[PDB]
Amino acid sequence: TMIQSSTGIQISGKGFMPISIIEGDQHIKVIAWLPGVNKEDIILNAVGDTLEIRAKRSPLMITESERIIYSEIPEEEEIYRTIKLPATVKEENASAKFENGVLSVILPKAESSIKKGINIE
Amino acid sequence: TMIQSSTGIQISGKGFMPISIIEGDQHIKVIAWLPGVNKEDIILNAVGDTLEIRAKRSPLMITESERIIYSEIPEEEEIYRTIKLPATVKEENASAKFENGVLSVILPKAESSIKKGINIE
Amino acid sequence: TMIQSSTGIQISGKGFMPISIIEGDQHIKVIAWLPGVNKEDIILNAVGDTLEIRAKRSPLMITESERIIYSEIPEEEEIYRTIKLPATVKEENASAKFENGVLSVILPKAESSIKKGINIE
Amino acid sequence: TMIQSSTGIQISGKGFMPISIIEGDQHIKVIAWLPGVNKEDIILNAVGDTLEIRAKRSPLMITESERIIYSEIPEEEEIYRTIKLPATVKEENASAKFENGVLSVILPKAESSIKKGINIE
Amino acid sequence: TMIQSSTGIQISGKGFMPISIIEGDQHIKVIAWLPGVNKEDIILNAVGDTLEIRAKRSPLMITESERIIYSEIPEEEEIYRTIKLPATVKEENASAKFENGVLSVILPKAESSIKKGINIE
Amino acid sequence: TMIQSSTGIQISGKGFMPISIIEGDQHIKVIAWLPGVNKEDIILNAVGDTLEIRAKRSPLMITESERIIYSEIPEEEEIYRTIKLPATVKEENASAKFENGVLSVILPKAESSIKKGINIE
Amino acid sequence: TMIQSSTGIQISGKGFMPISIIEGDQHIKVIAWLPGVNKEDIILNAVGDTLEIRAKRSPLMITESERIIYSEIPEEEEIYRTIKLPATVKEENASAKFENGVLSVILPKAESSIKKGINIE
Amino acid sequence: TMIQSSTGIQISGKGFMPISIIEGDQHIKVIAWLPGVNKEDIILNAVGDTLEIRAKRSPLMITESERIIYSEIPEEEEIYRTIKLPATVKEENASAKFENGVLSVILPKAESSIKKGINIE
Amino acid sequence: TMIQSSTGIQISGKGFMPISIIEGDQHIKVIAWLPGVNKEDIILNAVGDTLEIRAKRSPLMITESERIIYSEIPEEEEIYRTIKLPATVKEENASAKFENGVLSVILPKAESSIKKGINIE
Amino acid sequence: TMIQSSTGIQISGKGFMPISIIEGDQHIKVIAWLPGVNKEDIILNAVGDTLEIRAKRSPLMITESERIIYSEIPEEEEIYRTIKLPATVKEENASAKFENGVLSVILPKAESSIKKGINIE
Amino acid sequence: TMIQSSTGIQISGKGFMPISIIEGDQHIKVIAWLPGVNKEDIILNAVGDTLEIRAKRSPLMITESERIIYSEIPEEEEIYRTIKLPATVKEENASAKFENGVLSVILPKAESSIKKGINIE
Amino acid sequence: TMIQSSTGIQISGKGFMPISIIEGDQHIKVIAWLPGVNKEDIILNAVGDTLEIRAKRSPLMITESERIIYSEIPEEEEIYRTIKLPATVKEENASAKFENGVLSVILPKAESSIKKGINIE
Amino acid sequence: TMIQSSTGIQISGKGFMPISIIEGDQHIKVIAWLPGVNKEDIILNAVGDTLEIRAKRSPLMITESERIIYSEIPEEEEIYRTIKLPATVKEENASAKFENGVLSVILPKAESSIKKGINIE
Amino acid sequence: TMIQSSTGIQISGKGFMPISIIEGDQHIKVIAWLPGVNKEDIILNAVGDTLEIRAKRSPLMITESERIIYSEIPEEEEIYRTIKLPATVKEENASAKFENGVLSVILPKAESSIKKGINIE
Amino acid sequence: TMIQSSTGIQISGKGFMPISIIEGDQHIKVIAWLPGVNKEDIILNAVGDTLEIRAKRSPLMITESERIIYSEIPEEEEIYRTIKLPATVKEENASAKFENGVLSVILPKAESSIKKGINIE
Amino acid sequence: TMIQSSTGIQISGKGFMPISIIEGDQHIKVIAWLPGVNKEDIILNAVGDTLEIRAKRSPLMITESERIIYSEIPEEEEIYRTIKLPATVKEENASAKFENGVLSVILPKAESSIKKGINIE
């Protein structure tokens, strides 16, 4: 569930969705694992320093003669994550790809969040 | 890891791969979650009543300016599962599909494993 | 009491007042349970991203021949909750209803907190 | 739930309903907290020395864009309480009021349950 | 407090009041310890098989120069006990005495509760 | 029993006797709870800074048809308390009252124990 | 002692007295173990649905040269049991026998407690 | 059961049989509680310094309409006790009585076990 | 020390200084206990929503013949507290008083932090 | 509270008042922390070897719009301490000062309590 | 009590009586502590390898004005000890002395219990 | 040992010596158990409110052929007790008796310790 | 690692790097321990109120004949810390020195974070 | 430290100082262990029944090349003990010796504390 | 501190100093982490098979307006380590370097500690 | 006792003797606390790297009228310590002083244990 976790950055929501966050100097990359979710069932929103991923996977349909004798796959349908990013992003230049059940989001940092170098004497 | 689990049927192997087993009257359906795995990197073998799934997902490559500040995604590359099925299957008529990181295997039962009905008086 | 609770959003105060928070795309709805509280005894304030609900319920008055032989109802009079919302709201367009001891607050989001959609390629 | 509680008087039933019992010399007052319940959805019955309160509150309906990010309010719909009173009441003269989610029941005692004073010499 | 205690006979109420119950063949004697309570501050009621004793003792008044440096005496004012007797009593013939802070109540049994002897052969 | 208790002042003895000690500027008041004790059965002695209270209450006599089915009242007969007071008293001017099982003793302080005020500049 | 025990039927009292209760269709049989008790020292009373057994056994008398070097036999003298029966009995038709230290009581049920059969279709 | 107990004297056997042992100067008295045992069902044996008591009580017979709804009475049938006495007895002069389910055995001491007095100077 | 405490508002620092925070509609009052601290030894700073109180009390000086045989007074010299307030304050209109070792700070709220009322229909 | 503490010298009373005791060769100094207490509300008494400090601090008054959102300051009003000193003092030469909420009492020793030096050979 | 203790030799009885046993080559000496026991109240018997000491000390009598404020002395009246000796004694040649509450018994060993020396080669 | 014990009165010392203290209206009686102690080996001293009893009992001497196979008797030689009495005694009128190892001391109270009666109105 | 620590200021990152933060009136000083890190391998960035220190120390290289028989030095290569400062800094005027493996960063506060003094009346 | 210890006699103070107390018939001897303390640094005072020992030992001085690699010696400098003696002493006739770090004090008893002998009849 | 640790080689001392030991065939390399220590404040000594490193780092000096709000850096000044090496070294050919707070010592082994190879057949 | 303790240096022996060890560059100083020990009763030996201190203090002699009512001083007579020093000493140049029960030993280091400095480049 990951109902609440904070290491300077916040992740909340319900359901199974592993998430990796990659911080470059000029942008932030977010990788989300969404297996079994169609591309048209993903709502991707962002403003400021927060990003919302919403998805719905169809449940495992079976015939009446068929029955599930073993299952490790979670049965929840509606899953979502709200991520408070460490930097303010420019959401109008963001892009996303979805291949093999993996969502990759590129978020460019705002100019107020790009750090400037300090020279050491 | 799921190193060992037995409910009359055995699953062994290393890595993250949730698996659902669906038993019909004439066939067995196996659903495996493989997000981020290419279709050409999956080795699928079966004989008798055992089925082997082998897969390798590429690790998350990063540039030198980029760094992973948060990650829930497992980092193992080579994953596999060996499943001892409850029935003997005909592997020459088996089929498989791969959509959105989900592998679906249809295994037709052998004629020696199809159960016959008993009438109640 | 709910003296302190944080799931990315903060709730503080004293006394019994269950609260549900519903987040839409354009607004935030807050539902508060205030049974036995008159409509004129509720102070409702909001600015920025924080909302304060103050209420006072009259104590259970009894005649001198009467006595309380059993009571599960809490006896505190002054109750309040301070809620730090996840989004900045427009408090000049907020509305509230009070029916059957249930307070329902509609808070429209500010334009800096309405998230914009990202297209997936 | 208050599945069972006995202090000479019994309370059973399912769901959240705080109850205070006030005993006078000639009557018994029962106060029940029913927030969010309409007046027409309350069934109130009494005979002998037992009183039954039944209620159903409507579930919190949401639009498809809306979602519940926080909730302390219990989600059960059908709630009821059965109260065994300490005295036999006259149910044909009982009255009830419902204001701000609070139900107040006045139960007049039967003449066989009104206690008579003993003079001290 | 003795809020609830049952050994076939029930005692409930609030405050400090030791009670002895003496059962004869034709009557029931109840002894209550009420030190510091005036005779006019005792309400004694009975019907059927239940007896109610209500009392209020005045608090220990002190001058402003005086202070309580040690106290084992309880500070509650209103005390009461409700006793469910093992037999139905005739409350119209009951009597009570109060000497040296001790209340003694004589309750004659009803004819339906006086037990009849069984002869052994 | 209160076998031993010390808060700068000592109480010893056997049996049930709650005691409150009240210290004024010029005197010490001692309140003892003795319900069921006759006035003629109390021996009250004092010298220096110690006071002795001795009492005997008669046991609860019953007829042979009567029996005690419940009793919270203690059954000890001889009770006493020895109290080491915080100040030296004048025992020749002491007085005592006994009403409703409550003994009130007024002990005037000796002139060597009356404290003198210190002025603050 | 069996001070309190309830399985729909109550047993209270002091001392050693094992009791078996046998319920027929028309009567209730009570078996009590009273070894060492004379027949004339047993008081047996019943009314309604409660039965009282009272007994006194003589203490084990010894000469002054004699001494008790071992004893498992309880030393209490006055023993009694109060039994709340599951049915209302007719105490005017009750009978009792006492053989070998065993008391057997036959209590005929009242007509209001004799159950009637329900036919199954 | 008292399967084994030793305080210089031994008691073994199976079942419920309380036993008191009384030692005089010239004899030993043994009191055994055997309620519900007929006089003809008691086997009493003794030799040297050991005594054996054997008894069988009939089980509680019930009609087919009757059933046991409560029972504290033990259900074992064959009971016995073997007692190693502290002194050698003369078993040819022993006597026994059985009244009200109580067995009383008088065992005269042998001349080798009668202790002789020592004079103090 | 109160090294860290958070109820939506933060208190940090070292040493003994009890602090009460009072929130009005237009201002925030902070009460600090500083016994033994001179008025000239208090540094009081505030900006935004944080307030810093710094103080130094002189240590308890003793002559060489004198010694401290008992002491509950803490011995630390430099004490400070940093308080993150719930509202943005106007530090240019703040005032402070110091009487009897008690510091009282009045902080007027900024106009962006004064909450506006929501009308209920 | 410091209800009881003994290190050869006794401190009793109720409320928060840290106390340091300084023993010189000719006098005893007592330092008490009384923040928020007015100078006119302190009663200071001493005789023999005991000293009594009594104080009352006014409660923290608030306007109806104001509320206490955080408080570490204790809310008790009447505080006092009784101190049994290690030496007999001359109370007619005692003096006291009160600055910044700190009370300082100088108690000169009696001539019977001033220790005399022993020469070492 | 010393209810049971075995180091190859047995001591039983009730009450406080310390005993030392001294074994010589030809006799056994038994020392018993009997303070407060008269010389005429001691019954001393022996046969074979067992010795019985019986004593009764008078209880501590007090006048009605006197009371026992402290007591370590045991209050039991009848005391006795049965000692199973390691050797068979000749009770017809035994002697005893009683001085200062100490009983000293000389028991000559029988000829069947005097051990014979074994020569070592 | 009784190294330290305080119930308002103090007992210290080393060794086994049970002591009873009896307080009358005019005197104090002390009973000490000293078995095996000669009359000439007791040192008895008293002043003020403290009493010292010193005694030495001879050790249990044995021949070289003799040995102690069992011993409950304590082996310490020098025993003493110091008793701080509750009242000041007149040691010049004290008397003592020593019979059967029991020392009885009569200590008359000083006139400053004899308590005077207080009349109750 | 210091994975997460919050005292109003946040420290996150991986590896061994002790950090001290010193707050003046006009600036913030950050001291970081980086032993074994070259000056050219330190990336120092800051914006707003957050500061990032990145470093890589070369691993301890050994010849093939050499081996590490003991090591307390951590073996990680890439270390970093992200520090959320309590005040907004001016990163364009920041300076840094690196001496003896110690990094000292001087961060001037922004004018919006410099606190203003409050005068006490 | 020996902060508090009471065996009828009190020892208080700070630091390491073992003390033996020897009570004669006419005097009290006090032995104190003061190793490393000069004779001129000991303040010895006594009055009534209390004795004060004050001492200061110089700390272990080391050269800058020297360092302490092991130390069991306590490092406190100022040590003192206050002893409440069991008897009133005459401080004008007291003497003291100091050899090898051992202080021996001879305190002659006052005439009011010298006990008088009681004759036994 | 590493007060004592032994794995065939000993490390003792006080303070924070991580140490790695590298053993070659002909020499021993010791790496010590000393950040913030000047080169002139390091005393480096060796003889036989033991090496001593002594260092003093200056404490973190602050101006009076500055204060340390967070610190993980240890505050001890004098640090040292004594290392018992596994081999005897030649201290006259030893060398040391100090770069970036890291001390590297090269100790050539003595000829008695250089191991000789054993050929395997 | 300090039976065994090792921090690279060993201390063994029996009895109370605190010891401090001081290591210079050229010598070792040993400080031993021996209060109450005469100068002629100390045996001081050393060879190689081990030092032995042996001492005997005379026991505390008392007159027959005197007794020890309190004692913290240990009663052992023969005390010794064996110390394995960290360096080889020259025992022919050692010296020792004994003042106020403190033994101070100066042990010059051998030339094989004096460490030589290593220069840092």
Those residues of chain A whose CB sits closer than 8 Å to some CB in chain M are 6-8, 86, 112-121
Per the CB < 8 Å rule, is C105 touching I118?
A: yes
J62 CB-contact burial (10 Å; exposed 0-12 / middle 13-18 / buried 19+):
middle
Please report the beta strands in P5-113, taking only residues with DSSP state E, as ranges in sequence order: 5-6, 10-14, 19-23, 27-33, 42-47, 50-56, 67-71, 78-84, 95-99, 102-108
Which residues are CB-contacts of K114 (< 8 A; sequence separation ≥ 6)? K25, K26
User: Residue I89 gets which letter from DSSP?
Assistant: B
Do chains I and M touch, with touching meaning 3 or more CB–CB pairs less than 8 Å apart? Answer: yes
Q: In what order do the strands lie in the sheet with O95-99?
A: M67-71, O19-23, O27-33, O102-108, O95-99
What are the E-state strand segments in H17-89?
A: 19-23, 27-33, 42-47, 50-56, 67-71, 78-84
Selection from A14, A2, A13 nearest residue A76 by Cα: A14
Q: Using alpha carbons only, what angle is made at residue L58 by residues L52 and L63, rounded to the nearest 5 degrees?
A: 170
CA distance J10 to J83: 6
Q: Are A23 and B20 in contact (CB under 8 A)?
A: no
Tell me, yes or no, whether chains J and F touch by having 3 or more C-beta pairs under 8 A: yes
- Rounded to 5°, the CA angle J53-J58-J61 comes to 165
Instruction: Kindly list the residues from chain M whose CB atom is less than 8 angstroms away from the CB atom of residue I82.
Output: 8
Does residue G119 sit in helix, strand or coil? coil
Provide the H-helix boundaries in H37-97.
Answer: none
**Spatial separation of the C-alpha atoms in residues M116 and B8, rounded to whole Å:** 75
Shortest Cα–Cα distance, M43 to chain A (Å): 8
Residue type, G58: S
Look at the block and give the residue holding tokens 């978020």.
A107
For D65, nearest residue in chain C (alpha carbons): C24
Q: In what order do the strands lie in the sheet with J78-84?
A: F116-117, J42-47, J50-56, J78-84, J10-14, J5-6
Beta pairing partners, J54: J43, J80
Amino acid at G37: V
Nearest CB to I35 within list J20, J22, J100: J100
Is M98–A120 a contact, with Cβ atoms under 8 angstroms apart? yes
* Domain-embedded: residue L3: no
Neighbours of L75 (CB within 10 A): 10
Instruction: Measure K20 CA to nearest chain L CA, in Å.
Output: 4
With CB atoms and an 8 Å threshold, state whether N39 touches J7: no
List of chain I residues whose C-beta atoms are within 8 Å of the C-beta of residue J33: 35-36, 73
CA distance H51 to H30: 10
How far is residue L22's CA from residue K73's CA, in Å, rounded to a whole number? Answer: 12
Chain F residue numbers with beta carbons less than 8 Å from the beta carbon of L8 are 4, 10, 12, 82, 84
Tokens representing O82 are 């004594």
Domain assignment of residue A3, yes or no: no
Looking at chain P, which subunits does it touch, using at least 3 CB pairs closer than 8 Å as the criterion? N, O
The answer to whether residues J89 and J107 touch, using CB atoms and an 8 Å cutoff, is yes
Nearest residue to B73 via CA among B95, B91, B57, B52: B57
Residue with tokens 């004050």: N54
Q: What are phi and psi of K79, to 5 degrees?
A: -125, 145
List of E strands, A8-49: 10-14, 19-23, 27-33, 42-47
Which residue among K24, K31, K100 sits closest to L65, beta carbon to beta carbon? Answer: K24
Q: Do O48 and P6 touch (CB under 8 A)?
A: no
Phi and psi, residue L53, nearest 5°: -115, 120
Using a CB-CB distance cutoff of 8 angstroms, which residues of chain N are in contact with residue J113? 47-48
J47–F116 C-beta distance less than 8 A: yes
Q: Tell me which method was used to determine the 3D structure.
A: cryo-EM
Chain L residues with CB under 8 Å of a chain N CB are: 3-4, 10, 12, 39, 42-48, 50, 52, 82, 84, 91-92, 94-98, 103, 105
Helix (H, G, I), strand (E, B) or coil at M3: coil
Interface of J with I (CB under 8 A): 2, 7, 9, 11, 18-25, 29, 31, 33-38, 60, 62-63, 65-74, 86, 100-102
How many separate domains does chain F show?
1
Residue closest to E113 by CA, chosen among G46, G27, D86: G46
- Cα(J21)–Cα(J9) distance, rounded to whole angstroms? 10
Q: How far apart are CA A61 and CA O81, in angstroms?
A: 70
- Let me know if residue I1 belongs to a domain: no
- F66, E29 contact by CB (below 8 A): yes
Measured in degrees and rounded to the nearest 5, phi and psi for residue A117 equal: -75, 145
Please state, in angstroms and rounded to a whole number, the distance separating the CA atoms of residues E26 and B116.
80
Closest partner residue to A94 (CB to CB) among C8, C114, C118 is: C118
Distances (CA, A) of M16 to F41, L61, M40, M56, O60: 82, 76, 19, 11, 20
The owner of tokens 């019943």 is G46
- Burial class from Cβ neighbours inside 10 Å (0-12, 13-18, 19+) for residue F19 reads buried
Phi, psi of D116 (to 5 degrees): -105, 145
Give me the sign of the Cα torsion angle M31, M35, M37, M39.
positive
Cα distance from F119 to chain E (closest Cα, Å)? 18
> Neighbouring chains of B at 3+ CB pairs within 8 Å?
A
Query: Are G96 and E6 an interchain contact pair (Cβ–Cβ within 8 Å)?
Result: no
Per the domain annotation, does N1 fall within a domain?
no
Among P7, P20, P66, whose Cβ lies nearest the Cβ of N73? Answer: P20
Which amino acid is residue G116, in one-letter code? Answer: K
Say which amino acid occupies A15.
G
Terminal CA-CA length for chain J:
48
Would J102 be classed as within a structural domain?
A: yes
Residue of C9, C49, C118 to mutate, testing the A interface (most A Cβ within 10 Å of its Cβ): C118
Q: How far is CA C68 from CA D22, D48, D116, E71, I22, in A?
A: 4, 21, 20, 29, 35
**What does the block give as tokens for O51?**
């090496």
CB contact under 8 A, A97 and C121: yes
- Residues K72, L20: C-beta atoms closer than 8 Å: yes
CA atoms lying within 13 Å on the CB side of residue H114: 9
d(CA E85, CA A109): 81
Looking at beta carbons, which residues of chain L come within 8 Å of K2?
72
Chains that touch E (3 or more CB pairs under 8 A): D, F, G
**Gaps in chain I with C–N over 2.5 Å, residue before each:** none
Residue E2 in any domain: the answer is: no
Chain L: give the shortest CA distance to residue N36, in Å.
Answer: 33
Burial P43-74 (b: 16+ CB within 10 A, else e): ebebeebebebebbbeebeeeeebbebbeebe
Q: What CATH code is carried by the domain that includes residue G31?
A: 2.60.40.790
Look up residue P4 and give its amino acid.
Q
Domain of residue N30, residue span? 8-121
In-domain check, residue M75: yes
Contact between F53 and F37 under an 8 Å Cβ cutoff? The reply is: no
Residues of chain G in contact with residue E6, where contact means CB-CB under 8 angstroms, are: 4
Flag whether E touches P (3+ CB pairs, 8 A cutoff).
no
DSSP annotation string for K44-107: EEEETTEEEEEEEPPP----SS-EEEEE-S----EEEEEEE-SS-B-GGG-EEEEETTEEEEEE
CB < 8 Å to J68, chain I: 20-22
Q: Is H11 helix (H, G, I), strand (E, B) or coil?
A: strand
Q: Which two tokens stand for residue A66?
A: 């068929």
Residue E92, phi then psi, degrees to nearest 5 = -80, -15
First-last CA distance in chain O: 48
Q: Residue C105's CB: how many other CB atoms inside 10 A?
A: 24
Give the number of other CB atoms < 10 A from CB of residue N112: 9
CA distance linking residue E110 with residue E49, whole number of Å: 10
CA pair distance P121, B114, nearest whole angstrom? 85
Place of tokens 């992200």: M82
- Taking alpha carbons only, the member of M79, N78, D111 closest to residue I69 is N78
Closest CB to I68 among J9, J22, J34: J22
CB half-sphere exposure, G62, CA atoms < 13 A: 19
The nearest CA of chain O is from the CA of M34 a distance in Å of: 7
Q: What are the tokens at O30?
A: 């010791």
